[PDB]
Design a protein around this motif. Sequence first.
Motif, mmCIF file in Angstrom:
data_model
loop_
_atom_site.group_PDB
_atom_site.id
_atom_site.type_symbol
_atom_site.label_atom_id
_atom_site.label_comp_id
_atom_site.label_asym_id
_atom_site.label_seq_id
_atom_site.Cartn_x
_atom_site.Cartn_y
_atom_site.Cartn_z
ATOM 1 N N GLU A 259 0.816 -1.205 0.000
ATOM 2 C CA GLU A 259 0.000 0.000 0.000
ATOM 3 C C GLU A 259 0.862 1.273 0.000
ATOM 4 N N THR A 260 2.017 1.247 0.667
ATOM 5 C CA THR A 260 2.871 2.437 0.664
ATOM 6 C C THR A 260 3.453 2.652 -0.732
ATOM 7 N N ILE A 261 3.573 1.580 -1.510
ATOM 8 C CA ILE A 261 4.093 1.699 -2.872
ATOM 9 C C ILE A 261 3.038 2.429 -3.698
ATOM 10 N N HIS A 262 1.773 2.107 -3.456
ATOM 11 C CA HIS A 262 0.681 2.758 -4.164
ATOM 12 C C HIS A 262 0.642 4.259 -3.825
ATOM 13 N N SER A 263 0.832 4.595 -2.552
ATOM 14 C CA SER A 263 0.836 5.993 -2.139
ATOM 15 C C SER A 263 1.975 6.720 -2.851
ATOM 16 N N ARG A 264 3.131 6.068 -2.929
ATOM 17 C CA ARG A 264 4.277 6.666 -3.595
ATOM 18 C C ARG A 264 3.971 6.903 -5.074
ATOM 19 N N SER A 265 3.240 5.982 -5.700
ATOM 20 C CA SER A 265 2.899 6.137 -7.112
ATOM 21 C C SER A 265 1.974 7.340 -7.325
ATOM 22 N N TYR A 266 1.049 7.570 -6.400
ATOM 23 C CA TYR A 266 0.153 8.708 -6.545
ATOM 24 C C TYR A 266 0.922 10.027 -6.455
ATOM 25 N N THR A 267 1.975 10.065 -5.645
ATOM 26 C CA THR A 267 2.802 11.266 -5.548
ATOM 27 C C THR A 267 3.481 11.451 -6.910
ATOM 28 N N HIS A 268 3.966 10.344 -7.468
ATOM 29 C CA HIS A 268 4.627 10.360 -8.768
ATOM 30 C C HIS A 268 3.688 10.953 -9.820
ATOM 31 N N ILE A 269 2.424 10.532 -9.801
ATOM 32 C CA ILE A 269 1.441 11.051 -10.753
ATOM 33 C C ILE A 269 1.156 12.537 -10.496
ATOM 34 N N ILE A 270 0.785 12.873 -9.260
ATOM 35 C CA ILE A 270 0.472 14.250 -8.904
ATOM 36 C C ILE A 270 1.587 15.242 -9.230
ATOM 37 N N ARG A 271 2.829 14.853 -8.965
ATOM 38 C CA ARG A 271 3.960 15.730 -9.241
ATOM 39 C C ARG A 271 4.167 16.000 -10.720
ATOM 40 N N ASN A 272 3.741 15.071 -11.566
ATOM 41 C CA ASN A 272 3.921 15.259 -12.994
ATOM 42 C C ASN A 272 2.702 15.796 -13.742
ATOM 43 N N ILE A 273 1.717 16.322 -13.018
ATOM 44 C CA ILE A 273 0.535 16.863 -13.683
ATOM 45 C C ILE A 273 0.080 18.237 -13.193
ATOM 46 N N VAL A 274 0.434 18.618 -11.966
ATOM 47 C CA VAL A 274 0.027 19.930 -11.453
ATOM 48 C C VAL A 274 1.203 20.854 -11.126
ATOM 49 N N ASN A 275 2.370 20.271 -10.893
ATOM 50 C CA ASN A 275 3.565 21.054 -10.583
ATOM 51 C C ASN A 275 3.360 21.971 -9.371
ATOM 52 N N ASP A 276 2.360 21.642 -8.560
ATOM 53 C CA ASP A 276 2.046 22.377 -7.339
ATOM 54 C C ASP A 276 1.247 21.421 -6.451
ATOM 55 N N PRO A 277 1.813 20.232 -6.180
ATOM 56 C CA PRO A 277 1.244 19.151 -5.367
ATOM 57 C C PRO A 277 0.507 19.529 -4.080
ATOM 58 N N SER A 278 1.058 20.473 -3.321
ATOM 59 C CA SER A 278 0.456 20.889 -2.057
ATOM 60 C C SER A 278 -1.032 21.201 -2.137
ATOM 61 N N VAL A 279 -1.451 21.859 -3.209
ATOM 62 C CA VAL A 279 -2.862 22.183 -3.362
ATOM 63 C C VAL A 279 -3.670 20.887 -3.357
ATOM 64 N N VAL A 280 -3.183 19.890 -4.093
ATOM 65 C CA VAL A 280 -3.851 18.597 -4.176
ATOM 66 C C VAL A 280 -3.842 17.849 -2.843
ATOM 67 N N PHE A 281 -2.668 17.749 -2.226
ATOM 68 C CA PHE A 281 -2.533 17.033 -0.962
ATOM 69 C C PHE A 281 -3.309 17.630 0.210
ATOM 70 N N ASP A 282 -3.347 18.955 0.306
ATOM 71 C CA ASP A 282 -4.089 19.585 1.392
ATOM 72 C C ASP A 282 -5.596 19.375 1.220
ATOM 73 N N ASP A 283 -6.078 19.457 -0.017
ATOM 74 C CA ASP A 283 -7.503 19.282 -0.269
ATOM 75 C C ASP A 283 -8.008 17.893 0.111
ATOM 76 N N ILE A 284 -7.106 16.924 0.161
ATOM 77 C CA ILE A 284 -7.495 15.571 0.519
ATOM 78 C C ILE A 284 -7.997 15.540 1.960
ATOM 79 N N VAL A 285 -7.263 16.211 2.836
ATOM 80 C CA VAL A 285 -7.600 16.270 4.245
ATOM 81 C C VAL A 285 -8.918 16.981 4.530
ATOM 82 N N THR A 286 -9.153 18.098 3.853
ATOM 83 C CA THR A 286 -10.354 18.890 4.093
ATOM 84 C C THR A 286 -11.532 18.781 3.121
ATOM 85 N N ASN A 287 -11.317 18.245 1.920
ATOM 86 C CA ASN A 287 -12.411 18.136 0.951
ATOM 87 C C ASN A 287 -13.633 17.477 1.591
#
Lengths: 340, 340
Positions: free
Chosen positions: B115-143
């Motif tokens: 499962e941690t490998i899967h989490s790492r893959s999502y970071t890999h995806i997010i980093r290569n599509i928004v170039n501003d990951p924090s917006v995505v990661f923070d919204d997960i907690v509060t969305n």
Amino acid sequence: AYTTFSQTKNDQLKEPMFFGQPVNVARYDQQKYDIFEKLIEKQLSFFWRPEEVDVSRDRIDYQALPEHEKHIFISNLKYQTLLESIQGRSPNVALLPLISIPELETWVETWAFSETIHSRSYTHIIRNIVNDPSVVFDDIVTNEQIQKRAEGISSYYDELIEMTSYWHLLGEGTHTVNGKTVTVSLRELKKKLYLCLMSVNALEAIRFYVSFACSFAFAERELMEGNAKIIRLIARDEALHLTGTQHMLNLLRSGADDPEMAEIAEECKQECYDLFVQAAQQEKDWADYLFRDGSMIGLNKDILCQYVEYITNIRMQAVGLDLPFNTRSNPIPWINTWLV
Amino acid sequence: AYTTFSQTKNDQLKEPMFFGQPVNVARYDQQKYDIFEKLIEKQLSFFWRPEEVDVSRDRIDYQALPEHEKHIFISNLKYQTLLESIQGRSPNVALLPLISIPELETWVETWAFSETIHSRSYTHIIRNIVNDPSVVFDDIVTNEQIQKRAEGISSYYDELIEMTSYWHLLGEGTHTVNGKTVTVSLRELKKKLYLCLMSVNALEAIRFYVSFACSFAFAERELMEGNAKIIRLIARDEALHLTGTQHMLNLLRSGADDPEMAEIAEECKQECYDLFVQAAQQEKDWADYLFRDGSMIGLNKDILCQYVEYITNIRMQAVGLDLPFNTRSNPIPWINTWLV
Ligand SMILES: [Fe+3]
Ligand SMILES: [Fe+3]
Ligand SMILES: [Fe+3]
Ligand SMILES: [Fe+3]
Ligand SMILES: [Hg+2]
Ligand SMILES: [Hg+2]
Ligand SMILES: [Hg+2]
Ligand SMILES: [Hg+2]
Ligand SMILES: [Hg+2]
Ligand SMILES: [Hg+2]
Ligand SMILES: [Hg+2]
Ligand SMILES: [Hg+2]
Ligand SMILES: [Hg+2]
Ligand SMILES: [Hg+2]
Ligand SMILES: [O]
Ligand SMILES: [O]
């Protein structure tokens, strides 16, 4: 008070390594300490499968070994198995619930996982050199001599786990549980964690390397080559593991993380010191059992005791502790061949 | 109390999966339930690294996407990321303290690691599509729309963990903690475990599969193919994960592992049934938020609700529960190209 997903939106770069808010989102695009992200990457690049290693020649070598050499080899292997079994579950059960930064959380889970791989590698070896693995495994549980050298490891983890549960359930303060006054101090819990880390450092940086030496003494004889290849792979992982604890410890010491931890490190440095001394003495005492039926050409109690003092001094200096033993040269330089 | 190494020599082949004596020696030459050793073997053979997957064209695909489609893709991604974050730590923290057979203990640690490998893959995806990951990661907690299922899921795990600690510290009986009465029942604890397990089965067998559909719809249109390759590897692992919980549950309800569990499961079948329906309903409701600004090719509110009902029936029947929805054939046969 523990949660698998804290709803508070927090800056994971400002949390301390331990005792802060439980980790929510597992992100790896940034970290407070990139050393842990580097360790994860490195450990992942080292991935190996035990069952792939050919140990078909080991059965022949082992059976061909004199009874006393078989005793040395098997006793050492059973000890490694004991520690590996403990290292597979403990990091996760004792540390995981206390981590507050994502890179460290995943490092611990990756580290714990690589330990189960090591345990699996040991079954692979045992299974191929003995008729009934159950005798080897059951003996590990019983056999006072083995539990004698490992004495203190599981109990420390268990105590940290118990104190952690009380903290999560009751919070800090003085409580009344079934008519008994129970004190829960976060400061005390932090010291328990700090000292548990020191003990794990001594375990992987000292206890396991002494065992590596015993294993490679056979490799030096061109014997037990399958086991040797496995030990080389395991030692390669162990170097990352001890690197991880050395960093957790030295970072806490620096005062750059939790301020209270730097105070704690300083405050109980004598405990840190005593922990290593006792660990070293335990490895020495183990020699009496290991060589009960006789020793080997370049492997005996004297050589083992000299190596213990040698490696202990090196490991203790790496975490800033004074040296208890007289300085000396590597009593077994031939081990460098098998390491790194 | 819990221990990282039980000193009692026991027979690991006769212990129940949960609540028996804690596992001592991690051995893999034998097992009470063969399925867990096979799952460990399969999971290890599936090892992969997110970084090695080329996702260079996903950024351009994402940018060209219509606003509502970007919304669909990123909302789906954030939900998957939320779930993997929970699945990375929870199986270890929640199940490890209760496991009494070695093959199950290592499977859970291997499953968690996966499962941690899967989490790492999502970071890999997010980093290569928004170039501003924090917006995505923070919204997960509060969305808000996301943080509804997360709460329920984290709730089952957290309650099990809390009750486990009380059991380990105080044991069964009627106790008092700071003027309050605290009852600890092994029957209730066993029910909670049975409940996390059923919930985890729904999380991996239903919740994630609905998200896979949300993801492969883009792949069907030759878009976000970097993401698609990664999802294929993840779904491949997921099949093993759900197989694991299915066997755990069927063994527990059949009465072959623990008669009391078979008894307990029969008593809360209606609750489990409703627990499953609720999960399916949450996935359905998510459609209103996902297609609030418009749908897309081969994917819409009606289709998703059909797939949720189709998948739910299959999973529930697999664990012996009645079917809550009208039977039908796969509403989206094309998904089989990316799954199994
Ligand atoms: Fe190890
Ligand atoms: Fe290690
Ligand atoms: Fe997953
Ligand atoms: Fe999964
Ligand atoms: Hg420890
Ligand atoms: Hg040695
Ligand atoms: Hg201290
Ligand atoms: Hg110290
Ligand atoms: Hg010495
Ligand atoms: Hg759960
Ligand atoms: Hg979908
Ligand atoms: Hg139930
Ligand atoms: Hg259920
Ligand atoms: Hg539906
Ligand atoms: O290790
Ligand atoms: O998964």
